[PDB]
Write a protein that binds this ligand. Structure first.
Ligand SMILES: *[C@@H]1O[C@H](CO)[C@@H](O[C@@H]2O[C@H](CO)[C@@H](O)[C@H](O)[C@H]2NC(C)=O)[C@H](O)[C@H]1NC(C)=O
Ligand SMILES: *[C@@H]1O[C@H](CO)[C@@H](O[C@@H]2O[C@H](CO)[C@@H](O)[C@H](O)[C@H]2NC(C)=O)[C@H](O)[C@H]1NC(C)=O
Ligand SMILES: *[C@@H]1O[C@H](CO)[C@@H](O[C@@H]2O[C@H](CO)[C@@H](O)[C@H](O)[C@H]2NC(C)=O)[C@H](O)[C@H]1NC(C)=O
Ligand SMILES: *[C@@H]1O[C@H](CO)[C@@H](O[C@@H]2O[C@H](CO)[C@@H](O)[C@H](O)[C@H]2NC(C)=O)[C@H](O)[C@H]1NC(C)=O
Ligand SMILES: *[C@@H]1O[C@H](CO)[C@@H](O)[C@H](O)[C@H]1NC(C)=O
Ligand SMILES: *[C@@H]1O[C@H](CO)[C@@H](O)[C@H](O)[C@H]1NC(C)=O
Ligand SMILES: *[C@@H]1O[C@H](CO)[C@@H](O)[C@H](O)[C@H]1NC(C)=O
Ligand SMILES: *[C@@H]1O[C@H](CO)[C@@H](O)[C@H](O)[C@H]1NC(C)=O
Ligand SMILES: [Zn+2]
Ligand SMILES: [Zn+2]
Lengths: 648, 648
């Protein structure tokens, strides 16, 4: 009936043969495999002339598996789009060997149903690059039709490694997958996401793996290039080739470099543990040293937090079980896993807010007890002299700091677009509290009927959510928000003229100029999130009001003391550092995960903490400093009779 | 070299042939295909004696596709577990035909690498059951090794159909997938979730599809049986066969029945629209008729809502784009899509709370205006007679009803385990408000320093979240919660003895008995969520306090008027109906999605609204009634001087 040509073929040679409906070509390949060196093989097939009617069918038959594909290989698109690839390459799947040395045979089948003759080239090339080694970078080319996977074996004494792959050009989109060594290997667009840890990639992709997951002490690093870039977030093709005719691709190639490096040891966990406690417990012993010197000488939070916890549990469990690392916007280069937490470093860094808020609450309680005891002594200075001492708002600030730490840690177990508000929101409220804490301090009577906290929180939370949800700037909602910032600056000027002096006038004048300068950034439209900017503008406005109050106090003749000045300088320095690290942070939740991975950076401090972690440490130190400045700013006034002159 | 036997084979015959390393068997099948009748074919292969060394390799070659599998077919498990299936069946993928009548050939390749002879049976059977028809149920058997998919063509004039598949036994787990007719078909465990709408199934699985999605006016109903039941939530195998030896399966078969029925027309959308407005606008004209008769005769919500909206947008978009219907716990039998909302009926039913809360707010505003005008008249009865009129808490109840409607609609766009609190929570707060609204009404002086709302809300929200999050009852946290309910009943008795009369004593006595009866359900512990029970216990306790207050009023000699009595009877009837529908609701968020689909039920009213929707309509009517009873309960007292006797 049909003539079949069973021919013996050497390994590394390009075989150009003709096949039609009558002919079937059989290739027999014999190779020697060894347990010590794995060395997987790669089958390359190219169809020189395109057969529109019937594709050429290739079958690769091994001892324990069969891989079959059709060339030209037609792949799916997002909207009924077919992409045609005339070169297909696949690495053959090699099962583990029981003996020491084998002589294994695998047969390649070539056949077609098209009556006309079609020519092809078939070359099976041995891969000496199959095994990956620690600290060695391999650059290779892969295409949607040619997927490449490599094997890494765990060196003795290594319990976890990170698989980082970098590309010079963002596109085409790709999916790096880490799979156990149990054959077959899922290196196709349809089954790549079936098992293992996978994440889309444009320029960077880092996956941490551990020996406990893989009993065989080895894994496969499978890289599959997506046909379309929409998942990576780049662009959506809308033209290509119309209707049934498949688009011709294959000119799109992705060049990558896999580097498998040993993950940080348990020493970094201990050193990070000690650094976190050591810095903030230094403040604890410092204030006890400060206290001992003096003695010898003389609901909204809970409502905010519950959905946070629910989202935490569900999302972290989903990421752990499914392996879809695209869900959480971690810093995969610096994310360090402990138990079920993929990013322990961020949560650990969030301990600064908690500890410093607790310490500030203790300081407030001590001051309140001392003031109450002084009142019990019926001292005239405590009763009727100095700025009215109100500790409850200070308690609110301390509780706000502690709960900001809690909420930000709960957010940072899995930073994700569905949680961006949870980090930045309490920070603006604490700033919004430090805002008008001074105003209440100088004008306690105005605070009697203030009714401002709920309004401020509602305003900021409304502003910081729907604008992001609806869009990222429709050329430009963020320019509209810059106009809103301008009218807010006008409202600040309106508050100014309601408040008297030429120096005050000019001070708020360059305050408005500073706000507009910031509004320019709010132009070239807020590339990041308002969430970050609201905190930034709020903190900048808070520092401006700080300076306003200080210049007021110096102008009125009230002299700032040594402790307020030292706290002021420390707060400024630390605020500046915090701002620098806050500014360095960019992207994250707003961008797509593949585009978000591009900005990821390695660890900076102690091989454990990233830039954001440093921001958490610094912010808490700065905010503690701000609270302390507020606590001690009017100390000079307290030691003297209440001012006869009307309040500023 | 090797002897290949190209033999011509008829279609429906069991071919028993022997194959070894030397032999390769070639089968040529010729069949006639037509455009009007699709008629896809099915290839069955069974390997009689198991070959431990080398599996038997089968290749099916068609004009435009090649399907190749190995028998025995080894499939993956959750934890390095291999399941061996000795019978593999696959339907061949048929591309669309350009001519009218074709004579298409497809070749089946059988080969192995094992030196020893192995026997097999190969039978290719024509499927006259490929095409699905509306209203016709097909019962078929499928296995993890044998996946079955069927084609449904849209009849002219039908724009949407629902694909419902039912099984008599829950297990094994399965994945029904709906895919477009563009070949190949992804009927394997690894690639089934690649495209289309898929959902796991134990007993029921309903998928709504629309003509706009599929330009070809047809789709493939792919059913794949999972090897393990953990995703369906049943059990986790921990024994089976140890180490490398693959477990032998194939005794596990799933029997299903696919019924494709035409979805509800646009008439149900209009009728559901009219019924929703018609019922609640009847209350609007009724109270205007009531008002005209008299005239002629004479922040926590916003904080709760923002994460809700964010979760809405992300989850609904994810379900729409990925096709993973397991995420949202819809009522897929009664979920009716409108635009991007998969379940429009629930959101539409949630209009009752909004409209009735707005109407109650208008009634409160009218009463407040009338009372203020009467005070302006300096009437002694308004100034110093009757129960003190406090409209602000009534405003709180009305706003709570409106926001409960809003939040419950936002929840019901995608009911899901990460949103269960959002529906039930405001309802207990409204009940917790109706709780002690009467107490404030009789004892306004106690409410001056109450400070109870925040405490009650914190208690209920704490109770209703962490208990569910940590577990579903560890034999049993819900028995522990029943003990908590017992101590709460003891606290209620403590409140009783603080309050005087033997009748009051006995009344709270069977009130405690009723609570304990409810606690027994809290036993055979909470198959249901506490969330449902807290609402139920709260509403039952609220009705108990209602009856307590009414019996008090009748005992003191104060006669209830006609309107309060009619409102009381209507509220009871409607509360009873609401409770019945609330009780019928079960499962949902707590159980796994495959187990949740088992309890799904078809639409009851107007072919548009389910039982839960009826609960939304009834609850709002009952709660409006409760508010009205509270508003008019003391009307008799108002028309007379303030009671000299001390308040109850
Ligand atoms: C592998 O297959 C062939 C024949 O079984 C042999 O490989 C070469 O084949 C051609 C002759 O057909 C020549 O290049 C050489 O004479 C063969 N040997 C080598 C080393 O090139 C070879 O005999 C087979 N190898 C094994 C291990 O069976
Ligand atoms: C990946 O593809 C690029 C693009 O073709 C290769 O770069 C070319 O390599 C050929 C080698 O024959 C050179 O002649 C060209 O000058 C190169 N073009 C450049 C560098 O722009 C690259 O070699 C490929 N990498 C691998 C590992 O095959
Ligand atoms: C299909 O293939 C075979 C041979 O090409 C034919 O089908 C039958 O084959 C055997 C003889 O080898 C006998 O059962 C009959 O003589 C054949 N015909 C029928 C109808 O059974 C048949 O000729 C081929 N059909 C077509 C349309 O090409
Ligand atoms: C699905 O599998 C069941 C279980 O084997 C089949 O039920 C049996 O069918 C055979 C037919 O040869 C009967 O002899 C048995 O008595 C049946 N056992 C029962 C009903 O318990 C069922 O027929 C299969 N369905 C299909 C469509 O093949
Ligand atoms: C038979 O097939 C082989 C394959 O090359 C070869 O001998 C020849 O092409 C064929 N002989 C015929 C068709 O007579
Ligand atoms: C290797 O496999 C062959 C094939 O059966 C067997 O004869 C031989 O004993 C094996 N080698 C060892 C060391 O067991
Ligand atoms: C050649 O293969 C065919 C297949 O059945 C048959 O003629 C015979 O088994 C073989 N002849 C030999 C091995 O001499
Ligand atoms: C059917 O296909 C054959 C094969 O080329 C062709 O000759 C014939 O014209 C086609 N029929 C029609 C109606 O076009
Ligand atoms: Zn943070
Ligand atoms: Zn509901």
């Amino acid at each position: 009936p049909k003539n079949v040509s069973q021919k013996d073929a050497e390994f590394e040679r390009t075989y150009v043969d003709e096949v039609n409906s009558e002919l079937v070509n059989i290739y027999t390949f014999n190779h020697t495999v060894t347990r010590n060196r794995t060395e997987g093989v790669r089958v390359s097939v190219n169809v020189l002339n395109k057969q529109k009617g019937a594709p050429l069918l290739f079958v690769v038959r091994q001892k324990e598996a069969v891989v079959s594909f059709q060339v030209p290989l037609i792949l799916r698109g997002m909207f009924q789009r077919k992409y045609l690839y005339q070169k297909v390459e696949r690495t053959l799947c090699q099962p583990p060997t029981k003996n020491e040395s084998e002589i294994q045979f695998f047969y390649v089948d070539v056949s077609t149903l098209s009556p006309v003759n079609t020519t092809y080239q078939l070359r099976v090339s041995r891969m000496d690059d199959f095994v990956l080694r620690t600290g060695e970078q391999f650059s290779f080319n892969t295409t949607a039709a040619q997927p490449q996977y490599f094997k890494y074996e765990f060196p003795e004494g290594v319990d976890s490694v990170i698989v980082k792959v970098t590309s010079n050009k963002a596109f085409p989109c790709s999916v790096i997958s880490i799979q156990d060594v149990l054959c077959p290997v899922y290196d196709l667009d349809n089954n790549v996401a079936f098992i293992g840890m996978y994440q889309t990639m444009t320029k960077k992709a880092a996956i941490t793996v551990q020996r406990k997951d893989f009993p065989s002490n080895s894994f496969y690093v499978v890289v599959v290039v997506k046909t379309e870039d929409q998942a990576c977030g780049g662009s959506l093709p809308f033209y290509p080739f119309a209707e049934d005719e498949p688009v011709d691709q294959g000119h799109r190639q992705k060049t990558l470099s896999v580097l498998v490096s040993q993950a940080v040891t348990s020493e970094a966990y201990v050193s990070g543990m000690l650094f976190c406690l050591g810095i903030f417990l230094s403040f604890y012993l410092l204030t006890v040293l400060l206290a001992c010197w003096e003695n010898w000488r003389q609901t909204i939070a809970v409502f905010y937090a519950l959905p946070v916890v629910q989202l935490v549990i569900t999302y972290q469990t989903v990421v752990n079980v499914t392996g879809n690392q695209d869900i959480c916007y971690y810093n995969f280069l610096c994310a360090h896993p402990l138990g079920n937490l993929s990013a322990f470093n961020n949560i650990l860094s969030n301990l600064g807010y908690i500890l410093l808020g607790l310490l500030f609450l203790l300081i407030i309680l001590q001051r309140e007890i001392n003031h109450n005891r002084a009142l019990l002594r019926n001292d005239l200075c405590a009763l009727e002299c100095g700025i009215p001492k109100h500790f409850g708002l200070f308690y609110a600030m301390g509780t706000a700091l502690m709960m900001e730490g809690l909420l930000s840690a709960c957010y940072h177990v899995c930073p994700n677009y569905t949680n961006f508000q949870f980090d930045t929101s309490f920070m603006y409220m604490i700033a919004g509290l430090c805002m008008l804490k001074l105003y209440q301090k100088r004008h306690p009577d105005i605070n009697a009927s203030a009714y401002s906290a709920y309004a401020c929180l509602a305003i900021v939370i409304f502003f910081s959510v729907l604008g992001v949800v609806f869009g990222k700037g429709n050329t430009a909602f963020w320019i509209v928000f810059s106009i809103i910032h301008i009218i807010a600056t006008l409202l600040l000027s309106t508050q100014l003229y309601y408040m008297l002096y030429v120096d005050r006038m000019v001070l708020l004048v360059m305050g408005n100029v500073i706000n507009w300068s910031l509004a320019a950034y709010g132009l070239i439209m807020r590339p990041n999130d308002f969430a970050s900017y609201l905190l930034a503008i709020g903190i900048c406005n808070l520092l401006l009001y700080f300076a306003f109050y200080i210049i007021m106090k110096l102008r009125s003749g009230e002299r700032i003391k040594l402790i307020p000045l030292l706290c002021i300088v420390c707060t400024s320095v630390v605020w500046g550092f915090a701002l620098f690290f806050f500014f360095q942070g960019l992207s994250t939740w707003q961008k797509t995960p593949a585009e978000s991975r591009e900005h990821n950076r390695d660890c900076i401090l102690l091989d454990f903490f990233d830039d954001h972690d440093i921001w958490h440490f610094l912010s808490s130190i700065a905010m503690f400093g701000s609270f302390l400045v507020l606590l001690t700013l009017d100390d000079d006034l307290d030691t003297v009779q209440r001012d006869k002159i009307y309040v500023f």
